Amino acid sequence: VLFTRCEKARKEKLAAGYKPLVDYLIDCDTPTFLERIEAIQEWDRSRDDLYVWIPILDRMDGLLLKVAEKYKYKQDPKKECEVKLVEMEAHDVDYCLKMLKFTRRLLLNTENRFVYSSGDVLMYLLNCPNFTIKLAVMRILAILGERFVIAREKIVAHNIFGDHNLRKKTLKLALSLSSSVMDEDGEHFSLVDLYFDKKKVPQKWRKLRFTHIKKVTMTTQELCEHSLQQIFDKGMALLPAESWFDFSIKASVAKAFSDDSGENIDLRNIIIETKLNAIAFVNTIFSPPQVSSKLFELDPYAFNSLTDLISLSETKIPKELRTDALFTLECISLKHVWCSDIIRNLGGNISHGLLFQILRYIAKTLREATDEIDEEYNVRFFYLISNLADVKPLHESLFAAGLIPTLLEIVSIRNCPYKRTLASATHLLETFIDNSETTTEFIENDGFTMLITSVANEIDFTLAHPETWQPPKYSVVYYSISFRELAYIRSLLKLVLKLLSTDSGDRIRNLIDSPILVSLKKILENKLVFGLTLITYTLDVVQKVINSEPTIYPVLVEAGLIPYVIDNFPKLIGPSAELLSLLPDVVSAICLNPEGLKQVKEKGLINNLFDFLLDADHARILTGGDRSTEYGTDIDELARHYPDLKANIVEALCNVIRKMPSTFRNEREFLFTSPKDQKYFFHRKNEEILTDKEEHEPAYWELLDKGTMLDTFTSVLFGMSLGNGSFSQVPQHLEARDFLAIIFMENPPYEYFTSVAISNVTEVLQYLDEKYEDYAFMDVMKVLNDQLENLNDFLNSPNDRSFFLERDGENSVRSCHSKLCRLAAILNIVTNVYIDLTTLSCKRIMQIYSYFDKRGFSLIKNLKLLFQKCALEEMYIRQHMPDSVITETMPLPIVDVSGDGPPLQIYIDDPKKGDQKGKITSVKTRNTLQMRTILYTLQSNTAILFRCFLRLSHSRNMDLEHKDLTTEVHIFENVVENVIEMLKATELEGHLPYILVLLNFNTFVFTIPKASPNSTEILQTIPAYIFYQKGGYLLYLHIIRDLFTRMTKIKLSSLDNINYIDESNGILTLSCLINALTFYNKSMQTETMENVQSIGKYYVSIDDDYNIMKALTVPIKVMALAMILDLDKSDSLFKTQSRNVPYSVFKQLLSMLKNIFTNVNIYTKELYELHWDLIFPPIKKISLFEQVGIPGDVAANYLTDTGDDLPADNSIGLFSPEQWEKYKKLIGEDKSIYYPQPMQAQYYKGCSSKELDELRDTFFNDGLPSRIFTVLPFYPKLVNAFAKTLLQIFTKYDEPTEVFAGRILDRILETDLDDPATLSSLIHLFGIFLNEKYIYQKASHLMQRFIEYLEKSLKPEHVNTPWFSKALYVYEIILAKSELPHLEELSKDVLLRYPLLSMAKVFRIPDPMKQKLFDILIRVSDISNFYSALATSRILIFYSRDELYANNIARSGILSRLLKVIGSFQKLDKINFLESSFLLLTRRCFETTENVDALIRAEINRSFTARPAVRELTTILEEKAHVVMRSPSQFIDVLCETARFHEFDDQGALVDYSLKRFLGERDKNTQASSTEKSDIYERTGIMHLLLSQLMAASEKDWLSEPANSSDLPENKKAQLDPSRNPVCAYMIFLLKLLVELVSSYNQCKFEFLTFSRRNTYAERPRPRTTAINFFLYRLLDKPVGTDHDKHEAKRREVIGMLARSVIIGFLATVQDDRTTKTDVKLADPHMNFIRKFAIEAIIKAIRNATSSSKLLESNHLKLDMWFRIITSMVYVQAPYLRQLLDSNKVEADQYQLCKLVIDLGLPSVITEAMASIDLNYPFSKKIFNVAVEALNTISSTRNNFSDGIILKSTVSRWKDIFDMFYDSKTYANCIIPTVINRLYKVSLALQKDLENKREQEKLYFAPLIDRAGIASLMKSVFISKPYIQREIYHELFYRLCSSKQNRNDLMNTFLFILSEGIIDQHSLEKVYNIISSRAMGHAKTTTVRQLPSDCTPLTVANQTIEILQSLIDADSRLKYFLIAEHDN
C-alpha cells in the first residue's frame, strides 16, 4: 500500500532494478506474456519483492478480472443472486490457472507479500462450480493464509477476512466427504485404502442425496444419465438460490463415485487435495477454541489418516497430495495446540518410529541419488522439525531416542550434486543446537573436524571448474558464479561461526591443525568471483578469534592472511550494510600489537576508514536508520582504548568536510508552470481548475543525491557527538568559518527546514556551544545580516499589491523564492539553537550587547519590513483563489502545531471538519501549498525573535550598568518605535485581517511568553512605558471608536453561541474588540504587570519616584473614561431598549469600571520620562562638554562626588585656556530640556491625577448608580457581574450599602408578580448582595420582610416557573446560616484563661413560621423544572435533622415523583448532583436514633484509642465535620460522660485544649426495647417503591446501544462505557441504592424480605420468596447472543456483577457498636432465621434443572453464576463490597456461614448436584470447574475447630452533606463553649480534687462427604484436561483427607482403577460405569454410561499417576498404608 517517507526512496531506487525484466514482459503482447511466464519455474537468485512485479500483478488482475465479469461471477454485498450453476469453460482453464500458477511460485520464494492488493478479486473467482480452478484458487488462498499467520496478520478484514460470505463458503468446501467412515463390516476404511487392492468403497457414499426444507436423493446408476452440468441445472431449480453451494459440493462427489473412469480417481484426488487445503486455511483463520468442535467435532477422524500419507516412497499416493499434506501440518504446528498430538500420531518419542526413519531413507537416497530425488518436499521437513522444537517440552523427547546422530549422516556426504538440501539441514542443526547439552553430543560424534574439512574441499573445488558458475541474469550482483553454492558455503560458515563461541580454546586448536587458514585467503584473493557477503563472515571469523586468543597473532602473520588485508584495505569496501558497520572493530584488531599499531599510524589506514561517505551509494544503505549512529559510537571506542590514534582520526574529519562543498549541484527544480495561462498562481476567486492524481505534496529532499549524503554524514557526526571523544578538537584544527559552509546550501527546496539533518545538527551545535562559547555566534549573525541585505527587490516594494502575483509567469519568480527557502532554514536553525529564552547565560547576552554596539541597529528595520510584507503577502492569494481550495492547501498540519503563536486564524471550516486533505489537488495547489508554507513558519519565528532580546537582564536580573545598561534602553527604544509605524499605516477599510493579525502580534510580543504555572501574563513594564510616553494606547483608542460604530450600526443578531472564526463580516468586525479591550485592561490591572521599580538610582536629577507601575496606571485610567462618557451621552448604552451590543463587550467594559475605580495608593503631580540618551552622567556630556581633554574620570568625578547638575561649560576654574572660545557653540540643548519629557500632551485635559477625583463624580451621578433597573431587564445573563461593579463603586465612597438592598426590595414588591421578568433576576441580585460577609449584620429587618413576603402568595403550585430556584436559594442561605449549632454562652466562673475570641451573630428564624413553610413546601405535582427539583431536594434535606419531619417525608409521596423526575431528565450533566443529593436524602430517611448513638460512640471511642493529652480539641473538632452536625445534642450527651478531661492547670483555669484519653473513670449506661423495635416501623413504602421501579425498568430492553454515536471509534480515552442507554444508568443507580441500603441499615432487610405486588398488610404478614427468586431467576432473562458484541458482553457482566453484589450483601452483617472487642461466637437470633431462608432459596434451585435433563440444558447459564454465589458467600467478599463491612466482625461470619452450611450438608448437596452431569456435553468442564473450589473453600475455613464505579460507607456519606453546604471547617466554635458547661466543671474539678488531693496524702476429621459422592468425585480425572487446573484438584484431595472414614476408601478406589482398569480399551469402561454406579446408587451397572470419545488408557494413567505422586508428596502417614496387608 504505502510506506514511511524514507523507505519510499529505497523502494524507488530498487524499482530501477529488474528494469529489463519488467520491460521484458510489460512491453509484450499477451500471448507472449503467457509464454514468458512458462519459463521461470526455478529461481537462481535471492528473493525478489512483489513491489517490482506490482505492474505484473495489475496486468494479471486486468487480464482475469474481465473473465470474472464474463460469467458474472463477480458477487456483491448488496445483490445476492450468487451465480447460475455453470462451470467455467474448459479452454480458459489453463489461461485462468496458468497466471494463478505463477502466482504461487512468486509468493513462495518472494518476500513482503503484505503489499499484495488484488486478493479481493479471488472471491469473485470463487463461486466456480468447476473444481480444478477451485483447487488452484484455494491453493493461492492457502498461501495467502500463510501470509496471514506466517508470523502475525489479522488485519485488513474487509479485504477477505471480514467478508462473511467466505468463511461459510470455505467451511462448506471442507467437511465434504469428511474422512474415513465406520462401515459395519470394516474397522474404519482408511482413505489410504482407496489405492490398495483391499477393502472396497463404503457404497453408502455411492448415492445422490441432499436435504435441508427440501430433500432429494438418487442411488448410483441413476447418475449415469445427467452430466455434472445437467445434474446442477436439474437440481438448482427446486432449491433456493441462496442454496446450491452444498449441492455443488456433493453432486460432483456423487458423480465421481458413480463410476470408475480413469479421470475419476483424478477427481477424487482433486477433491481430497482441496479438502486438506481448506482445513489448512480454516485453522489459519479460525481460533483453536472454535475449531475444537466447529470442524473437528463433525470430522473426528482427521489427524489419523493424515500422517498416513507423509512417510516416503509409497508409490501409490500422489506426490502432489503428499506435498499438500506436508503443507497443512506446517500450518497447524504454528501454534502450541496440536503439536503433541502430531508427535504422537507420528512417533517422535521412540526411536525407529516415523520421524527418525524417513531421515534414514533420505540419507539412503542422497548416497546414491539417481532417481526420484525431490527437495522442495524435503526442505519443508527440516522446516517442520524445527517448528516442533520451539515447544520446549516437546523436543527433549526428540534429543533422546537419537536425532543428532541421524542428521549428522545426512551431512558429510561428498561429491553431492544436490547441495540445496544440505543448506537447510545445516540451518536446522544451527537452530536445534542451543544448550550446553546437545553441543557435547554433537562433538563426541566428530562433527567438528567435519565442517572444517568439508568447507576446504568446497572452496578448492569452487575455483576448479569454470564451466560451473552460472550466475543470475536479471539483477545487481557481486558474485557472478551461482547462488546455491554461495548459500551452501554461507550456511557452513554460519554454523562454524556459531560453534566458535562456546569454549574457543579447543576449537581454535582444532582449527589450526587443518587446511583452512590457507584456504580462507583464497576468498579475499578475488571477490569478483565470490560475492560480497562472504567477506563479511570471513572477516568476522578473523576478528573474533584474534580477540579470543591474544597469543595467536604470529601464526596468523605468516600464511599471507594479514599482510594481504592491510595492503588492500581500499580494495574490499562495498555497498553492504553489515560490512560497512564492521570496519571499526576489525581495525581494532589488526592493531593489537605494536607492529600493527605503527603500520596503522602509517600506510594511510585511518584516512580510508572515513571518506566513501562522499558517494551517495555508500552513505545511503546506512541511511541513518539507527544503523549509521552505530558507526559513530564504534569509532569513539577505537580511540577510546588507543590514545596514540587520537591525532590521526581528527585529520580525516577535517579533510572530508573541506571537500564536501564541492559537489552540491543544483539538480531538480523549485516549482512548475501551470499547464495553461503560464502562471504559477491563481487570479480569481471563481475559476476552473484541473486535477491530477499523486501525493498531495511533492515530498522532496529525497532521491536528490545530496539530501541523502547530508542525512548520513550528519547522523554519523551526531553519533560520534555522544559522550566525549576527539570531536572536542575539531574546533581547534578547524575554524567556525568553514563549518557553516556545509549547512545552508545554495538552493534548498521548501521543506528543507523540516528534516533530521537540521534536527541532528541542532543537537551537535549545542554541544560545541556548550564548551566553546565565542566560536559560532558572530559569524552566524553576520550570515543572517548579509542574507537579509541581499534581499531588496520585494522587501521595499509598494505595500498595496501582490508582489509575487505582480510578476507571475516569468523566470524571475524562481529567483525570488529561492532565497526565501534559505532564509527560512536560517531562521529555523537560529531561533532554536542560539536565540531562545530558555537558554540565557549572563555571559551570553553580553554577545548581543557587543554585537549591536560595534555594528548598530541595521537588521531591525529589515526584520520589521519582512514581518510587514509577509502577513500582507499572505492575503491577496486568499483574495484571488477559489477559497474552497484554501482548506486543501491549509499549511498548518505539520510538525510544531503549537497554535500558541501569532499568525494563523482564517479557518473556513470547523476545527473538527476531519482531514479533507488530498481530496483535490493539481499543479496550482502545489505551488500555493509551498508559497504559504514558508510564510507561516517565517512569521512564527519572527515573533519569538522579537521577544527574545526584549527581556535581557530582567529575565535573569543580571544588574547591568554603564556601557552595558546604557545600550539596553537604546535597544528597547529602537525596538518599540519600529512596530508602531506598521500600525500607523495600513488604514482600516479594505484590509481588516491585517489589523487583527497585527493586534494579535502586539498582544503576543508585548506579553511575556507562557510563564508561571497558571499566571497567563505579566505585562512588560518598561516596554509599556516606552509605548505610552512615546505615544501609546492612543493608536488603539481611535480604532476602538471606529469599530464600535462599525458594529452598533450593523443591520437583533444571534451571536450568543458562536465559534470557528471565519470571514463572515460580522465576526471579524467584532473579533478585534475583544483583543483590544483585553490588552487595554491588562495595563490597568495591578497584578498583570511586572515589578520593575526604578527611577531610584535611575534618574536622580528630580524629586519623587512616579514608579513606572503605580504611576503608569494613572494616565491610562484618566484615558478611556472620556470615551465611556461620550458613548453614554450618545444613544449607545446605559439607555434605550433592547440589546444592541455583543454579549461579551459588557463583561469587558464592566471589568474596566471595576478597574477604573480601583485606587491602590497614589496621588501624582508630574511624571518624567526615561530618556537614557541623557542618563546619570549623560552621553551628551562626552559628546560636547567633556570632549576637549576627554575628562572622562574628572568630569564624572566632579559630577558625582560634587554637585550632580551639569552647569554647562565655562572658564571659571580648572579649565583649559582653549575650553572657552571653543565651547561657544550652542543655542539651546540639554539645559532646560535636560530633563526628559515630563508631559507633552494628553487626550482631553490633564493626565497625572486630579482629572480623576473630578471625572468620577460626573459618571457617579449620571448612569448605573441610579439607572441599572432600566438596563438590567435587557441583560439578565451577566447579572452575576453587575453587582461586582456596584460594590466596587460604593466601596471607596460613603457607606449606604444596605440602603441599596432596601431600595431593591421596595422595588421587588412592586414587581407585579404576574410578570416572570424582573423578579427572577432581581431575587438573584438580592441573594448575591446578601451572600457578602460584611453586608449581613445590619440587614435583619430586611430578611424578615422577605420571609413575610415569601410566606403568603407562595401558592405551592408555584414550582413550574423560573422564579422558584433563586428564591429557594436565598432561603437556603438564610436557613443554613440560621440553624447552626444553636448559640450557647457559658457562665458560673468559666475561668476563660485567655478567653475565646467569641463568635459573630446570626438570625434564628421564628419557630412557627418554619412549620408553615414545610406545610407549604411538601406538596407538589407534575414537577418538570429540573432546577426547581434540584432546589427542592436541597431545601428538604436540611429539615431531616429532626425525626417526625422524616416520618412525614416518608409518608408524603414526594419521593414517589421526585424519583421518576430522575428518568424524566437523563441526558444533562448535573444529573450527577441530582442523584447524589437524592441518595443522601434517601439514606437519611431510615436513619433512626438507635443507629446514630451506636455509630457516634464507635467514632469517638476509636478517636481516643489510636496513635497516629492526645487528640487536641482544636484539631479533632475540626475533623469532626461529618460528625456533630448530624445531631449535636446526641454527640454532646454521648461525649459528656467520658474522656475525663485532664490538664486542670496550676490555677485551675485551662491553658490547654487536648483532653485526656478514653475515659479514665468510665461510666455505666443501659438502653433496650429497640432490640425488638430495630425492625418494624410498619414498612415505610420506600423499599417497595424502589423494588417496583426496578421491576418496571427490568423489561426496558437494556441491551440496545444508542441509535448512533457518531465518531465513537474516533474517541479520546476509551470506548465501551456502560453509560448511555439511559436505562443502564437508571438500573445502575437503583442497584447502588439497594446494595448500599440493605447492607447498611438493619431494618431495611425486613422490607426486602416481605416483598409483594399488592403491599399486603398486618403484622409480620408472612416471609415471602418473590425477591430472592427474582434476583436469581428472573433477572438476566434477556435472550441475547447475536454474534460478538463487546457492548452486550460488558453490559451483561457489569449488571451481573452488581446482582451478585446485592445478593451477597443481603446476608452480610450490618456494622454497629460491636467494634473494638474480641468476640467468641454467637448466632443472630433474627438474622439467622433470615440466613436459613436465604440458603434454603439456593438449594431448591440446585435440585431443579438438575433432574429432567431438558431442564439441565437451558439452565447452565444460571448454573454458571449460581455455584459462584456460594463461593462468594463462604468468602466474606464481593466484587465491590470491600469497605462497607466491619472487618474485625467478620470472624463469626465465616463460623456461622460454615456451620449452617454444614447442617444442611451443602457439600453433600453439591456432590449430588455435581453427579448426573453427563460428561459428553460441552459445558461439562465448565460446570465441573466452578464447584471444585467451592468444596475447597468450605474445607479450608473448616480447618478451624478449636469498571470505574465508586461506593462509600455510612460515616463517609455524612462528609459529603457537611461539605456540600457551609464549608468553613471551624464551626465547632459554635459548640466549643457548650461542651465547657460539663467539659471541666465536674471533670477537672471533681475527679482531680477527689483523686489528686487524697493521692498526695499517701504519696475434627469428621466425615465431610458420603461414600457414594467421593466415588462420584472420581468421575473427575477422565476428561482431556490441560494443566494448571490440576492444582486445585490436588489441594482439594490433600485437604479432603484426614477423614478417616474416607481416607481408607479414597485410595481404595484408585488402586482398583489401576490394577483392573488400564489394560486395554474394553477395560476402562467397565470401571467408569462402576464408579458411576457408585454415584447414582442403584443396582449394579443396570445401564451403560458411554465414554466421552476420548481418554485412552494412557491419558487416564497419566492423570492418575500425577495425582498419586501429588498425594504421596504430602501425607507422612500415607506411605505406611501404601505398603501393608489390607487385612481385608
Numbering used by the authors: 2 to 213, 236 to 1074, 1076 to 1532, 1539 to 1872, 2220 to 2276, 2450 to 2574
Quote the passages of the study that discuss this structure, keeping the authors' original sentences.
Tom1p is a large, 374 kDa member of a broadly conserved family of HUWE1 factors (also called Mule, Lasu, Ureb1, Arf-BP1, HectH9/E3^Histone^, Ptr1, Upl1, or Eel-1;). This family is characterized by a large N-terminal domain attached to a smaller C-terminal HECT domain (Homologous to E6-AP Carboxyl Terminus) that provides ubiquitin ligase activity ([Fig fig1]). Tom1p has been implicated in the turnover of excess levels of small, basic proteins including ribosomal components and histones. We determined cryo-EM structures of Tom1p to reveal a helical repeat solenoid architecture for the 2,888 residues preceding the C-terminal HECT domain and an overall architecture that resembles the published structures of HUWE1 but with a larger fraction of ordered residues.
We performed single-particle cryo-EM reconstructions of two Tom1p constructs: full-length Tom1p that contained a 20-residue tag including 12 histidines inserted between residues K1074-D1075 (Tom1p^His^; physiologically active in all phenotype assays) and Tom1p^ΔAD^ with the C-terminal Protein A described for intact Tom1p above ([Fig fig2], presumably inactive). These structures were determined at resolutions of 3.97 Å (Tom1p^His^) and 3.07 Å (Tom1p^ΔAD^) for the dominant closed ring conformations ([Fig fig6], 7C, S6). The two maps and structural models were very similar to each other, indicating that neither the internal affinity tag, the absence of the acidic domain, or the presence of a C-terminal Protein A scar induced notable conformational changes. As expected, the acidic domain was disordered in the Tom1p^His^ structure. The structure of Tom1p^His^ is very similar, with the exception of more poorly resolved density at the UBM domain. The Neck is followed by the Body domain (residues 507-2,888), which comprises a helical repeat solenoid structure that forms a ring architecture and leads into the C-terminal HECT domain. The first helix of the HECT domain, residues 2889-2906, helps to close the ring by packing between the HECT N- and C-lobes on one side and the Head and Neck domains on the other side. The Head domain largely closes one side of the ring formed by the Body domain to create a basket-shaped structure, while the HECT domain is positioned to one side at the opposite, open face of the basket. Mutation of two residues in the Head domain at the solenoid closure interface reduced human HUWE1 E3-ligase activity, suggesting that the closed conformation is important for the catalytic cycle.
